[PDB]
Design a protein around this ligand. Sequence first.
Ligand SMILES: C[C@@H](O)[C@H](N)C(=O)N[C@H]1[C@@H](O)[C@H](n2cnc3c(N)ncnc32)O[C@@H]1CO
Ligand SMILES: C[C@@H](O)[C@H](N)C(=O)N[C@H]1[C@@H](O)[C@H](n2cnc3c(N)ncnc32)O[C@@H]1CO
Lengths: 136, 136
Amino acid sequence: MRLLYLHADRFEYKTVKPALKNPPDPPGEASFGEALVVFTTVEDGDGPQTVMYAASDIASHSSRLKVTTVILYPYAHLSSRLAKPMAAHKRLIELEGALRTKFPGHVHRAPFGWYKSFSIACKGHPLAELSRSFTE
Amino acid sequence: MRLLYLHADRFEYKTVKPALKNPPDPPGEASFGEALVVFTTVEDGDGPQTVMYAASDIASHSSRLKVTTVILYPYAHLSSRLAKPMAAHKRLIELEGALRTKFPGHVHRAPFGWYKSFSIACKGHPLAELSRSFTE
Ligand SMILES: C[C@@H](O)[C@H](N)C(=O)N[C@H]1[C@@H](O)[C@H](n2cnc3c(N)ncnc32)O[C@@H]1CO
Ligand SMILES: C[C@@H](O)[C@H](N)C(=O)N[C@H]1[C@@H](O)[C@H](n2cnc3c(N)ncnc32)O[C@@H]1CO
């Protein structure tokens, strides 16, 4: 699993065309104020262990940033070893679920399988953009 | 070399704290309308061949998008095999130079070695976000 952590003043997205034949989540749009935006790429081999490490890391990073909103934003582009779409969707659902058992704020998982427009205002402090790898 | 291509309606950045002991480019800020924003991570081993492939690809992608502005935005987070900062800065300078010999529009290379805030409005069409790897 490969993640990009973006500490944002605001974030918004909107689904547009389907990027998969039958996207497993419905279309939609949402916008947020200050949030940790987590671009999430599921890699071949990612399992329950990986999900658990990622969830713990997101929770502790969110806590140090003092954010109360986390966006789990599915992203195809952070790896050249992608999990298949069925497995990836499963892992992202598991990730959202696991995060709620460790983090008390708003957790929003963006729809999987869509092209999306997005806008972000990313903060410029030293911890505002980080990347993480998790494996098992 | 690893690149992320973001077709944006607008982009802006501002340097904040230094991310390196002595950043080799001066601090600054800039903002743009519609542009191809290229997040650029230089990898260990990237040489003139890599620069040339990347430059050609950016030029042809920019042409299909019909954009007339390209932002070369140094980014540490797209690889786990980073080039050292001296080599990386050199390669990004070479990349900007090479791009101008292939692309007729505005080429803006953001300062290397700084933490930056940024804001982007990324388009949602199927070709709006792509990743590329170049090697030699
Ligand atoms: C394109 C851009 O605007 C959008 N943001 C996009 O990247 N969409 C991806 C993910 O939503 C999802 N997807 C498929 N496989 C994976 C995977 N292994 N990991 C994460 N997501 C995946 O399926 C889409 C196309 O494969
Ligand atoms: C942090 C964030 O806001 C900002 N955008 C940042 O990521 N800054 C990076 C790049 O500007 C540059 N840098 C160093 N090595 C490399 C490399 N191999 N490739 C590209 N850039 C590099 O040096 C900074 C810290 O290493």
